[PDB]
Amino acid sequence: SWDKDVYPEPPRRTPAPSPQTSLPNPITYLTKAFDLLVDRPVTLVREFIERQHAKNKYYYYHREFRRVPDITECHEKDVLCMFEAEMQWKRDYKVDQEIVNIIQERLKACQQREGESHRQNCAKELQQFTQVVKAYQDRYHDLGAHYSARKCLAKQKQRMLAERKATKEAA
Amino acid sequence: GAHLARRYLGDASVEPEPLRMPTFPPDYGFPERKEREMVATQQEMNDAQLVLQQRDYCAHYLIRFLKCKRDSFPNFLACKHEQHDWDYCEHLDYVKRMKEFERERRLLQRKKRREQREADMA
Amino acid sequence: RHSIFAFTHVLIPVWIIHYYLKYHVTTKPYTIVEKKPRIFPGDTILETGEVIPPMKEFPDQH
Amino acid sequence: ITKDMLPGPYPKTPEERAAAAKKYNMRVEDYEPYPDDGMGYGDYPKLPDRSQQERDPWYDWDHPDLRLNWGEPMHWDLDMYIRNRVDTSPTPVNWNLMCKHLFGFVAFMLFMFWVGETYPTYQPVGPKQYPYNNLYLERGGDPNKEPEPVVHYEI
Amino acid sequence: TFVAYLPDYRMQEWARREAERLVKYREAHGLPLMESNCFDPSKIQLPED
Amino acid sequence: DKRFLKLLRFYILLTGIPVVIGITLINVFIGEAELAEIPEGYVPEHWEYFKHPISRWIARTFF
Amino acid sequence: MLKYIIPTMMLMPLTWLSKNSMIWINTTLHSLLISLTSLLLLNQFGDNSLNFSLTFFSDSLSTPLLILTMWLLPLMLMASQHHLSKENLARKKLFISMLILLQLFLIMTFTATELIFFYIMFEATLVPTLIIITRWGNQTAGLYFLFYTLAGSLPLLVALIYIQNTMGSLNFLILQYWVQPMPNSWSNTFMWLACMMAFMVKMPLYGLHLWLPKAHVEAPIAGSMVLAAILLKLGGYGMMRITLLLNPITDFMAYPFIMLSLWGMIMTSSICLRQTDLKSLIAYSSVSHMALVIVAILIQTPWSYMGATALMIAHGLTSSMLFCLANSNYERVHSRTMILARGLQTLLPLMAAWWLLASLTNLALPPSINLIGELFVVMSTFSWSNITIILMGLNMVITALYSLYMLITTQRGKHTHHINNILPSFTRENALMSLHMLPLLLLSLNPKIILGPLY
Amino acid sequence: MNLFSSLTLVTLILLTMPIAAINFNTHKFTNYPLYVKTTISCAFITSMIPTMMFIHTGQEMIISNWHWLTIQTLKLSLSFKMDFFSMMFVPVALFVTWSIMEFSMWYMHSDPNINQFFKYLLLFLITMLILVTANNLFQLFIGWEGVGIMSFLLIGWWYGRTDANTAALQAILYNRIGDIGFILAMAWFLINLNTWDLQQIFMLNPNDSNLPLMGLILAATGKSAQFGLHPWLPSAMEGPTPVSALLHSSTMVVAGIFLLIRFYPLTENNKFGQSIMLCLGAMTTLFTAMCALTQNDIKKIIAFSTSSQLGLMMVTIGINQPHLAFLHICTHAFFKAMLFMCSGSIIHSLNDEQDIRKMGGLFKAMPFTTTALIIGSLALTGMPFLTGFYSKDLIIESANTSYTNAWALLMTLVATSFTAIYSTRIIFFALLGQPRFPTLININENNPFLINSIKRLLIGSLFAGFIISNNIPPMTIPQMTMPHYLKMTALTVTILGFILALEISNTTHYLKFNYPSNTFKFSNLLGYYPTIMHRLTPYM
Numbered sequence A: 001s002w003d004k005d006v007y008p009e010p011p012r013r014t015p016a017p018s019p020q021t022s023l024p025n026p027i028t029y030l031t032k033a034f035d036l037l038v039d040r041p042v043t044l045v046r047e048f049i050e051r052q053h054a055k056n057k058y059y060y061y062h063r064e065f066r067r068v069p070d071i072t073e074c075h076e077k078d079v080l081c082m083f084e085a086e087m088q089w090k091r092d093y094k095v096d097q098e099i100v101n102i103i104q105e106r107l108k109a110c111q112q113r114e115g116e117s118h119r120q121n122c123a124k125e126l127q128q129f130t131q132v133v134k135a136y137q138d139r140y141h142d143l144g145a146h147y148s149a150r151k152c153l154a155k156q157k158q159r160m161l162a163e164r165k166a167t168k169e170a171a
Numbered sequence B: 001g002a003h004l005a006r007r008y009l010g011d012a013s014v015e016p017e018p019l020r021m022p023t024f025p026p027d028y029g030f031p032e033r034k035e036r037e038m039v040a041t042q043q044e045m046n047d048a049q050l051v052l053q054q055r056d057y058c059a060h061y062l063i064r065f066l067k068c069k070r071d072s073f074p075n076f077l078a079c080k081h082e083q084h085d086w087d088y089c090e091h092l093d094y095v096k097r098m099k100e101f102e103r104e105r106r107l108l109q110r111k112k113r114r115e116q117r118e119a120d121m122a
Numbered sequence C: 001r002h003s004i005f006a007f008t009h010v011l012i013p014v015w016i017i018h019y020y021l022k023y024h025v026t027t028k029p030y031t032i033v034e035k036k037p038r039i040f041p042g043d044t045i046l047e048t049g050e051v052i053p054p055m056k057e058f059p060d061q062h
Numbered sequence D: 001i002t003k004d005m006l007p008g009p010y011p012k013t014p015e016e017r018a019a020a021a022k023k024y025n026m027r028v029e030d031y032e033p034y035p036d037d038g039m040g041y042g043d044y045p046k047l048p049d050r051s052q053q054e055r056d057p058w059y060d061w062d063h064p065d066l067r068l069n070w071g072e073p074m075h076w077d078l079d080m081y082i083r084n085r086v087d088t089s090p091t092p093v094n095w096n097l098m099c100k101h102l103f104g105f106v107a108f109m110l111f112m113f114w115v116g117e118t119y120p121t122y123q124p125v126g127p128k129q130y131p132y133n134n135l136y137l138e139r140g141g142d143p144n145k146e147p148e149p150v151v152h153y154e155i
Numbered sequence E: 001t002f003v004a005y006l007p008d009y010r011m012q013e014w015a016r017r018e019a020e021r022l023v024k025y026r027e028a029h030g031l032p033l034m035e036s037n038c039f040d041p042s043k044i045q046l047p048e049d
Numbered sequence F: 001d002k003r004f005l006k007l008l009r010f011y012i013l014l015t016g017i018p019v020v021i022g023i024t025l026i027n028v029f030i031g032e033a034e035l036a037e038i039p040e041g042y043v044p045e046h047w048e049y050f051k052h053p054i055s056r057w058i059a060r061t062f063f
Numbered sequence G: 001m002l003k004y005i006i007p008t009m010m011l012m013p014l015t016w017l018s019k020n021s022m023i024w025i026n027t028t029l030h031s032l033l034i035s036l037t038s039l040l041l042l043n044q045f046g047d048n049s050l051n052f053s054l055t056f057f058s059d060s061l062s063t064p065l066l067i068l069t070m071w072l073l074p075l076m077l078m079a080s081q082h083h084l085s086k087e088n089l090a091r092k093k094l095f096i097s098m099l100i101l102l103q104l105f106l107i108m109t110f111t112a113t114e115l116i117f118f119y120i121m122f123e124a125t126l127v128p129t130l131i132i133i134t135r136w137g138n139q140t141a142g143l144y145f146l147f148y149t150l151a152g153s154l155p156l157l158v159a160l161i162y163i164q165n166t167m168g169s170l171n172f173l174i175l176q177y178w179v180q181p182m183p184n185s186w187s188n189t190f191m192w193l194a195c196m197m198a199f200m201v202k203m204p205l206y207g208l209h210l211w212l213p214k215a216h217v218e219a220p221i222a223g224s225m226v227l228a229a230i231l232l233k234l235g236g237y238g239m240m241r242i243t244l245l246l247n248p249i250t251d252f253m254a255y256p257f258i259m260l261s262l263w264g265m266i267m268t269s270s271i272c273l274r275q276t277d278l279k280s281l282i283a284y285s286s287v288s289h290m291a292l293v294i295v296a297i298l299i300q301t302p303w304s305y306m307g308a309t310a311l312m313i314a315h316g317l318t319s320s321m322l323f324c325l326a327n328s329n330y331e332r333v334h335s336r337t338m339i340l341a342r343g344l345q346t347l348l349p350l351m352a353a354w355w356l357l358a359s360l361t362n363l364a365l366p367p368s369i370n371l372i373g374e375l376f377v378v379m380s381t382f383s384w385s386n387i388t389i390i391l392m393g394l395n396m397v398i399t400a401l402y403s404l405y406m407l408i409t410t411q412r413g414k415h416t417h418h419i420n421n422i423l424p425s426f427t428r429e430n431a432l433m434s435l436h437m438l439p440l441l442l443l444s445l446n447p448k449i450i451l452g453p454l455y
Numbered sequence H: 001m002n003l004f005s006s007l008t009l010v011t012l013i014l015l016t017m018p019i020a021a022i023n024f025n026t027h028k029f030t031n032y033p034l035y036v037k038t039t040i041s042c043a044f045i046t047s048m049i050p051t052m053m054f055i056h057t058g059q060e061m062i063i064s065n066w067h068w069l070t071i072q073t074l075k076l077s078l079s080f081k082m083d084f085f086s087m088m089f090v091p092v093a094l095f096v097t098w099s100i101m102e103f104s105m106w107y108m109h110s111d112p113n114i115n116q117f118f119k120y121l122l123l124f125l126i127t128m129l130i131l132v133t134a135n136n137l138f139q140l141f142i143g144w145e146g147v148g149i150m151s152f153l154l155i156g157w158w159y160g161r162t163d164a165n166t167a168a169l170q171a172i173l174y175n176r177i178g179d180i181g182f183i184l185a186m187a188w189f190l191i192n193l194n195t196w197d198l199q200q201i202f203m204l205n206p207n208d209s210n211l212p213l214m215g216l217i218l219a220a221t222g223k224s225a226q227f228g229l230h231p232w233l234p235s236a237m238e239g240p241t242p243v244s245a246l247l248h249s250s251t252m253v254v255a256g257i258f259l260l261i262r263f264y265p266l267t268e269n270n271k272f273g274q275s276i277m278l279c280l281g282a283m284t285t286l287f288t289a290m291c292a293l294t295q296n297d298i299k300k301i302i303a304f305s306t307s308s309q310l311g312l313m314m315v316t317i318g319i320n321q322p323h324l325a326f327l328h329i330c331t332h333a334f335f336k337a338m339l340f341m342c343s344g345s346i347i348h349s350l351n352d353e354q355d356i357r358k359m360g361g362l363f364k365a366m367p368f369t370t371t372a373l374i375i376g377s378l379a380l381t382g383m384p385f386l387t388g389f390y391s392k393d394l395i396i397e398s399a400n401t402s403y404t405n406a407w408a409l410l411m412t413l414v415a416t417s418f419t420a421i422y423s424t425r426i427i428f429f430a431l432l433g434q435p436r437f438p439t440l441i442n443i444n445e446n447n448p449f450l451i452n453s454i455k456r457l458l459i460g461s462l463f464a465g466f467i468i469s470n471n472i473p474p475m476t477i478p479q480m481t482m483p484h485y486l487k488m489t490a491l492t493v494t495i496l497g498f499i500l501a502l503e504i505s506n507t508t509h510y511l512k513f514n515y516p517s518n519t520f521k522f523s524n525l526l527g528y529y530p531t532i533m534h535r536l537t538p539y540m
């Protein structure tokens, strides 16, 4: 299963079927036929296979990368430290890509799950999506195909000079 | 379809434009005109997933018709009276829109007569 | 071997696809996202148990 | 195959013209080459620029899909004048009248679409009026703010 | 069969799961989902003017 | 051409059917691992960072 | 990479010590073993390349090129053994040795960590290729070599020696971290052209492309396969390694050459609609497809590099299959005239099915990796400018047309009356078609291994 | 949840199973077309259960079942979208396809490549259900190019003929000119909205969406044979009659209309796209239905008929009424496939005769074909309470009663009259009059394949408009208050077309020889449009 905190969902409230007419619908009979003929054999096969899994339980792990010094506190043209900073920045870049992907998954799931009232009910997911895409665009856009930590730091310094001049001319 | 020729081949100063109207106050000619009363609650149609074209001042008959159309399955022809209620209320809303258009036409005729009497007097 | 077509082309694919959708696709987040069911005034929720209060008496027209 | 049957340079002397007409397997008086400007055609004949549709369709051809005979000098654009591609066949209506009718019909129809877009047709009704501040929260309005009240009246 | 079972080719799956950590870390502590700055602006000297 | 297609099906299935049945036996009997947190002081090997057993064998043996 | 170079060199005693009838079977078997071995190059990571030694390293750019290079040799041995069955046995072993030596040069051209070792291997690949084309080609100046080496290889040599003396190293791993911005000047402008024009000719670039529709026609089948499958991609690989150093001058110096490609893929594609030679049609199609690789490298966005490496791998596969189909017709009618033999689906249905699949992957039918590369290049060039899509889309009209016209001219219509030596398809030929097409179809099931260093 | 998505994917996997059957063979089949017909029957019955449990509630979902490719911000998953459009187009397409293949067991019975024919026809069905169940633009482009390539392969079915390959390559050229606009649309959505998934496109809600909608309109102009890019559909009658019946009437040619219906939340916020669609659709439904007035090849007449109906669909997308356009698709499929099937029965009975000037006397000679073709022509013209009444007339009721281009409305009404004109032209030259065909009458229609195949689409053409139109939920508000000259517009102009063309038909029995003027030579030569652009543009 997954975490309901990183993938939030509202509680699914279905209404109980109140048939106004007297005619028996084929949906409930096909549902019970699906539950007898299909659901129970698949479930028993999965129970046997899951027992066969649990007869040899063994675990894999999520690899943890400790923080190394970034490109800023690396000396210039010292490949032994800026290599580590570059691999740090590349792993963080790929993880930021997948964070933007998770927010896209939330936005699409909210839009489909709300249906027609999506423009009303998914303003929060749209706002979080706008925040994370604005952050990704300020962080990594227009670096080109030969992107590096140096190019990203140069973009961040140019952005900080523009923001500093904008704040200073305001005061 | 007389209004097309009355706006194109006659004069345009007295026929009301479709885009920017009503050009008059709501109570200009109406003493104690009541506001429209909404029947459907906003959350009741937020939970009814209605199209925003359909979230007008008469969507409560549409909510009743959709509850009928869901509940009367498979008998898909057992909801004619709810449909005719909703169509009759749409007909009354269309008649109210026609009354809006005719009110605008008669106020522009009123303005035409007013400016002609002002020109002939002064 | 008279209804072998309904067995080998329906029942075995329904088994395979329901197994794949239940234990590998729905176990993943947001893969089968179902639109929530339309709630009317007059519904009874199976999950919460609260009956939705109905609409106002109508300003009758006929 | 050898050298003196392949295409060579453009002919200058009339005996070279006669030897090339014997080379291209055709009459000398119907042998006419391309204009010598340097486009690289050589001694190749200017066939009369008719497609393979106007060739005899009932005739026993060597190549019945192309309607062509063995040894006959092919057109320079023989790949182009195939019956999958551009034709030279006559139409019962002239080319210039077809250009005039097609261009005039397209221009007159699109001009009448522009005129009708300038002059729309519509219904003798007002705008469709919507509750809850003309559907402010439904059209995506933020809940922290409050719009101006859009209140409609009975008529 | 070999290409089908490449052990997390160029660590995308990890990067999904690691993302599934970090968003979960920054829904709890109220931090925004992603900063506009990649590095800390305290550890950046700027060319003065 | 049909002899080529018979040979093509035979020589693909000749190791495809053992590979399909073997992956089926691994996924039924041996089976997919389960995600867990690292113990306090335990160092995993690199092939113990992968979920599928064939991927674990590939990362251990060759990579 | 030493675990691949040494079996490649052991293919030399494996091809000379073998028996008089065993030098195709042994070489094909053991080269397929090396091609199965080649999948260990897929030990790639999202941050770090697979760095073996000071001399050799293999990131996710060189890895699909290496797998395609080591896969191409058994396919060339299957292709070239029919028409060499009337050749002398020692010259047969000479041909196989030239192919093995060319593979040897290529597999350490793509894995050269250092740039002048890349240059020496890059200009060493031309010698077995020229021996193969001039000796086992069919028909009969030479000024193309001179014009190639004036505007190409030795300006690249002087340029790399200049980078060696300025930076201190031509290691690509060091030059990832010691790259300097290259400002606007005239010295840096001729520096940029000296670095780029050798690979520009090796792509080919439009206007510099006329060497290829003659070198494909004067080649045997193995020469055509190794030209259009790998040797044209040495230019793209060298450009993707050399545009690191050439920033930000490329941001205003890529403007001319992109024009030459964006119009060139319009022209050569249309030239493919007016061909009589089938092999020249495949050659001009190869030029029109490599034009998009030139564009995607010169605009240097990530989506463009992913599309360009996908298009390189997919085009190597597709063009090699088209040359092998043209070989299968040349070994029956003894003439490369496309309008000569027609209607061949009436005689060879499975070979016409392979023609259909090759023409579908030629016009980038989704979800093939041809369409994946084509589509990502079109996305990145739409990001470059919103007008180029027209020049893309018009191309994607014409790239359908000659893909199907070639399918309609040869394989459809009425069969030719005066040609009665059309044999049924041999098992070797359909095996060659299937070993070209089935990897190309299977890569549609998992394309992330052929999408370069920045997927 | 467990039933809906399961049977959704079971329909598609069941369609893919005979491809594995025809590819994993050694022996000669015990009637493989019967196997594919039984398979598509079963896929229709399988797809009817999610349709019923969508009629019950309105249960939409998405099956994003296989994560295929992640290009740094683009998660291309194998994503299926089961909404109203899939739930109402998939069983109609399966029912029409099952009828076409039981027709095809008889029409293509003397073919020694019947297995390849049914393989190609099932590949077309698989690609179209990729096209209409797609949730991202890449999978929709797969289905789009798939129906384009199967259009090539099924137009050039008799590949020895030069005109068949010519029409196939022509169809490819016009569809790739549409593909320019579709790849333009994909490029715009990736660069400006970072997505090909329809959910994020609908959620982000772009305002400056002129360029992607012009791309989609160019894609539909290529695919749905609108004006500028129409002539490949009159050329596309060169293939077999079940090809022109399945693909080029009901299944392939609606894909551009289906593309513009699928993008209705973007077209409903843009008046410029609505105006372009309205003008181009009125242009198409004028021009193609006018070119149908002067033809004698019956498949050309029904090809211009289905292109005129596609232009009417483009009109009712241009008036911001997408669900009425989609109901006109699902209505149009039944009787237009049946009209091509009855025309093919007339062709096969008269020894491959497609020219209506050598037909006649077939009122009692082919009575079941006569009955079914009269019912199809009436359901084409908008006879009251047949299936074509339940969408097409409603289109007119919303084409009059809206803020609309008036000239586009007037051309729509002229096209509505022209439909009745060529329908009674078909009935007069084909079923009415006297025999004009040769002397050895081998007229026969006594095969249970042919009877059952026309019979099921005839039950469809009698009942399916009523049944589908009463089973939908209301996604719009129907305009139901209008003046009596404006309610009775389409029926009156249709009857006027009937009567004026009965005058035109009764002119033919007069013994007077008239020289044809520029109107007959204009329309008979296809409005002069396939003459110039097929000679002048490839020359340059």
Ligand SMILES: CCCCCCCCCCCCCCCCCC(=O)OC[C@H](COP(=O)([O-])OCC(O)COP(=O)([O-])OC[C@@H](COC(=O)CCCCCCCCCCCCCCCCC)OC(=O)CCCCCCCCCCCCCCCCC)OC(=O)CCCCCCCCCCCCCCCCC
Residues within 6 Å of the ligand: A041, A042, A044, A045, A048, A049, C015, C016, C017, C019, C020, E001, E004, F013, F015, F016, F017, F019, F020, F023, F024, F027, F028, F031, F032, F052, H009, H012, H013, H016, H017, H020, H065, H126, H130
């Ligand atoms: C089949 C043989 C065919 C002939 C052989 C030759 C085949 C060709 C040669 C291939 C050679 C190898 C090539 C490389 C592939 C290797 C395998 C691989 O990578 O597989 C990938 C992938 C991953 O497999 P994996 O990595 O092993 O699984 C990882 C998990 O950890 C694993 O999870 P888990 O461990 O939890 O799962 C264990 C799983 C075992 O896992 C496997 O089997 C997977 C491994 C084998 C896969 C082989 C793939 C080969 C190619 C298949 C596809 C093409 C086939 C040909 C064409 C078909 C028609 C199109 O157990 C089961 O599945 C058992 C349940 C069976 C259900 C059915 C019966 C239930 C009711 C029974 C009632 C009776 C008894 C009741 C009482 C019992 C009491 C005790 O496998 C698949 O995708 C399997 C294929 C089927 C998937 C679902 C298909 C339906 C999807 C529908 C929607 C999408 C399509 C839409 C189309 C739209 C129209 C166009």
Ligand SMILES: CCCCCCCCCCCCCCCCCC(=O)OC[C@H](COP(=O)([O-])OC[C@H](O)COP(=O)([O-])OC[C@H](COC(=O)CCCCCCCCCCCCCCCCC)OC(=O)CCCCCCCCCCCCCCCCC)OC(=O)CCCCCCCCCCCCCCCCC
Residues within 6 Å of the ligand: F005, F008, F009, F012, F016, G349, G350, G353, G354, G356, G357, G360, G361, G365, G366, G367, G368, G438, G441, G442, G444, G445, H022, H023, H024, H078, H116, H119, H123, H127, H130, H139, H142, H145, H146, H149, H150
């Ligand atoms: C990793 C495990 C993978 C397992 C699954 C396998 C995945 C696919 C692999 C390739 C499958 C096709 C191979 C056979 C076709 C080529 C030879 C041929 O003509 O055979 C006909 C022959 C039967 O015909 P025949 O009457 O005997 O002789 C032919 C006639 O003379 C005259 O011939 P014809 O004209 O009547 O028939 C040719 C016909 C002509 O039809 C066409 O040309 C129309 C096709 C294009 C339009 C329709 C499709 C559009 C795209 C949608 C589909 C893809 C996405 C679907 C998913 C949903 C949406 C995303 O094409 C077909 O019937 C082929 C159907 C499959 C086509 C695949 C795509 C080709 C289109 C071009 C590229 C498209 C992009 C790449 C897509 C890749 C997808 C995996 O079939 C065989 O003998 C089959 C032998 C066994 C083949 C094994 C293939 C796998 C090899 C890999 C080995 C290692 C992995 C283990 C897997 C083993 C699986 C068994």
Ligand SMILES: CCCCCCCCCCCCCCCCCC(=O)OC[C@H](COP(=O)([O-])OCC[N+](C)(C)C)OC(=O)CCCCCCCCCCCCCCCCC
Residues within 6 Å of the ligand: E001, E002, E003, E004, E005, E006, F052, G063, G064, G065, G067, G068, G071, G313, G439, G440, G442, G443, G445, G446, G449, G450, H016, H019, H066, H067, H068, H123, H126
């Ligand atoms: C690589 C560069 C050089 C190019 C040339 C290389 C030549 C040498 C060849 C070496 C061997 C081959 C290498 C490439 C292998 C690619 C295949 C591969 O491994 O895939 C992995 C992919 C992996 O996909 P995945 O990413 O989902 O993997 C999941 C991860 N695991 C398995 C660990 C859980 O395998 C599959 O996708 C298999 C899926 C099942 C089989 C296919 C089912 C569908 C088939 C079609 C059904 C019908 C549909 C309708 C069609 C109708 C007709 C048109």
Ligand SMILES: CCCCCCCCCCCCCCCCCC(=O)OC[C@H](COP(=O)([O-])OCC[N+](C)(C)C)OC(=O)CCCCCCCCCCCCCCCCC
Residues within 6 Å of the ligand: C016, C019, C020, C024, E012, E013, G367, G444, G445, H065, H066, H067, H068, H069, H076, H077, H078, H079, H136, H138, H139
């Ligand atoms: C017909 C024979 C079938 C098998 C019969 C015998 C086996 C028993 C029956 C049950 C089936 C086997 C067990 C369940 C299946 C395995 C479950 C599992 O873990 O699957 C792992 C995975 C699930 O995906 P995933 O997300 O876990 O892994 C992908 C890997 N990453 C994330 C790194 C990208 O693979 C599959 O399930 C593959 C199924 C593919 C089905 C459709 C194939 C279509 C091919 C189209 C190619 C081109 C597409 C282009 C467009 C795409 C969209 C833009």
Ligand SMILES: CCCCCCCCCCCCCCCCCC(=O)OC[C@H](COP(=O)(O)OCCN)OC(=O)CCCCCCCCCCCCCCCCC
Residues within 6 Å of the ligand: D083, D084, D085, D086, D087, G273, G390, G393, G394, G397, G401, H163, H166, H167, H170, H173, H174, H177, H180, H214, H217, H218, H221, H227, H228, H229, H530, H533, H534, H535, H537, H538
């Ligand atoms: C929303 C906006 C909508 C806008 C709509 C208007 C825009 C499009 C304008 C029209 C463009 C297409 C028409 C012009 C080219 C038509 C080519 C064609 O179809 O030729 C058909 C011809 C055979 O047909 P025919 O002779 O009729 O067959 C009878 C049987 N013997 O076949 C041949 O002769 C074969 C020819 C092969 C060589 C063709 C070389 C030219 C290729 C031209 C590609 C055009 C690319 C356009 C790019 C647009 C980018 C935006």
Ligand SMILES: *C(=O)CCCCCCCCCCCCC
Residues within 6 Å of the ligand: B001, B002, B003, B004, D121, D122, H400, H485, H486, H488, H489, H492, H493
């Ligand atoms: C007022 O008359 C405007 C109505 C809308 C535009 C004119 C429509 C004319 C055609 C409809 C009536 C046709 C009756 C046979």
